[PDB]
Design goal:
part of a larger assembly; 6 chains; A mainly alpha; B mainly alpha; C mainly alpha; D mainly alpha; E little secondary structure; F mainly alpha; DNA-directed RNA polymerase II subunit RPB1 (chain E); Mediator of RNA polymerase II transcription subunit 4 (chain D)
């Protein structure tokens, strides 16, 4: 059967955690140029509250989209540095996610 | 849990512990071609193949619808020529 | 391609759609007093939770003060004893008549599997109990911190009193 | 590391997304 | 001899532009 | 050679299960009764 929009949006959110997916999406000019994609990104922000957050599979993307949120006022430029910066800042970002959830 | 008194396993027949050669009286041929005799000495010289079973026959084995009358007549004519 | 295309509705919502969303939802609520897609602005309306409270994905289904266990203990002890006994009987089978040994092997595994099923029902009963072991560790840590704080300020107050006595004696 | 075990990764699997119904949903986006 | 060697000008931060497309079977 | 291997492994297995039965009786007397039956199930 045809999946509902819940399933596709949740799978998109969980796939946003992949660094390769983010690099590919930012590689194309019209994806970032079009305001539709960033409008959808800001629309996706409302999943950080329960009970929606209970349905997530990988919490890392929760910050990544938020990090992607920062990308709208930080610039495309910085795309090259994305894998290095995520690899370097993985420890502290995981720690802050744990502080937000595990405590 | 799995202890079933109704499940009984019988001994495997024939028992490998016993002398399986003598179970059916099968010692004659084994003694005939035994490696060594009762005293341990070599009985006969041992080799690999059928050649020595034909040595008694004359010869030098150094290396190891149909009309019969018509064929015989043809061979006779060929030899007489 | 390697990367699936973005969702289609993503491209429908511009800044104008975002700013006109309030009047659109007001009109929709006034009119209202699977959702059919009659207008391009319908998706911004929050999707409704399914009544069955279930979600299917990849062939799998998904959906208070913390915010006879002796029977299960004795069952697990007798199951362990029976498992050892069945292991002995199975190795005896291998000894005498190994040809049918498998006839018992899987049987033993079933017991192991039943121990694993008890150890699975036992998880929502251990996983939450992790928060308990955490409870006492931070509780004892904060008690240690507290007690060393009244200790150090009491020994400072004692030093101050001793100094006061010393200066009074020198008067 | 060399044995690709299914349904247990640190990050979302590319093969999981490929086998996910979102792939055919995007393929059948016209039917949507 | 050699007046001066060249300074290492590696750019690992370069993201590269390798096209990836034949992944689907 | 195969027959000698079979006989030696049979003797080894017999001593294995004899010792295992003896020790299971020793440290676990409550399971002593089935163990003998196990022998009756095997022998």
């Amino acid at each position: 059967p045809l999946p509902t929009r819940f399933e596709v949006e949740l799978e998109f959110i969980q796939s946003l955690a992949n660094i390769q997916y983010v690099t590919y999406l930012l590689t194309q000019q019209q994806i970032w140029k079009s305001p539709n994609f960033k409008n959808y990104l800001k629309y996706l922000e409302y999943w950080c509250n329960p009970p929606y957050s209970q349905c997530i599979v990988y919490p890392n993307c929760l910050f990544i989209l938020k990090l992607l949120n920062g990308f709208m006022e930080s610039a495309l430029e910085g795309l090259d540095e994305l894998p290095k910066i995520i690899q370097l800042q993985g420890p502290q970002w995981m720690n802050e996610m744990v502080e937000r959830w595990a405590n | 849990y799995y202890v079933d008194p109704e499940t009984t396993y019988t001994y495997q027949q024939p028992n490998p512990l016993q002398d399986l050669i003598s179970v059916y009286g099968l010692d004659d041929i084994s003694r005939q071609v035994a490696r060594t005799n009762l005293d341990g000495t070599k009985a006969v010289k041992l080799r690999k193949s059928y050649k020595n079973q034909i040595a008694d026959l004359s010869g030098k084995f150094s290396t190891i619808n149909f009309d019969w009358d018509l064929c015989s007549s043809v061979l006779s004519q060929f030899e007489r020529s | 391609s390697l990367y699936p295309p973005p969702p289609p509705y993503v491209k429908f919502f511009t800044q104008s759609n975002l700013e006109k969303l309030p009047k659109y939802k007001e009109k929709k609520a006034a009119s209202a007093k699977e959702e059919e897609i009659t207008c391009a602005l319908d998706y911004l309306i929050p999707p409704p939770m399914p009544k069955n409270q279930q979600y299917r994905a990849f062939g799998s289904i998904w959906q208070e003060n913390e915010s006879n266990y002796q029977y299960k203990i004795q069952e697990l002890r007798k199951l362990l004893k029976s498992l050892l006994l069945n292991y002995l009987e199975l190795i005896g089978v291998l000894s005498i008549n190994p040809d049918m040994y498998e006839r018992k092997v899987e049987n033993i595994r079933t017991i192991l599997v039943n121990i694993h099923h008890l150890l699975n029902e036992y998880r929502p009963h251990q996983s939450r109990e992790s928060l308990i072991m955490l409870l006492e560790e931070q509780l004892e840590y904060k008690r240690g911190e507290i007690r060393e704080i009244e200790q150090v300020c009491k020994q400072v107050h004692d030093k101050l009193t001793s100094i006061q006595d010393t200066l009074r004696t020198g008067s | 590391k060399g044995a690709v075990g299914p349904n247990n990764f640190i990050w979302p699997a590319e093969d999981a997304l490929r086998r996910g119904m979102l792939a055919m949903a995007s393929l059948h986006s016209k039917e949507l | 001899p050699s007046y001066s060697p060249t300074s290492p000008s590696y750019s690992p931060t370069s993201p590269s532009y390798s096209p990836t497309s034949p992944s689907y079977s | 050679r195969s027959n000698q291997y079979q006989r030696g492994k049979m003797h080894g297995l017999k001593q294995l299960r004899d010792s295992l039965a003896d020790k299971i009786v020793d440290e676990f007397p409550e399971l002593k009764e089935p163990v003998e039956d196990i022998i009756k199930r095997t022998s």
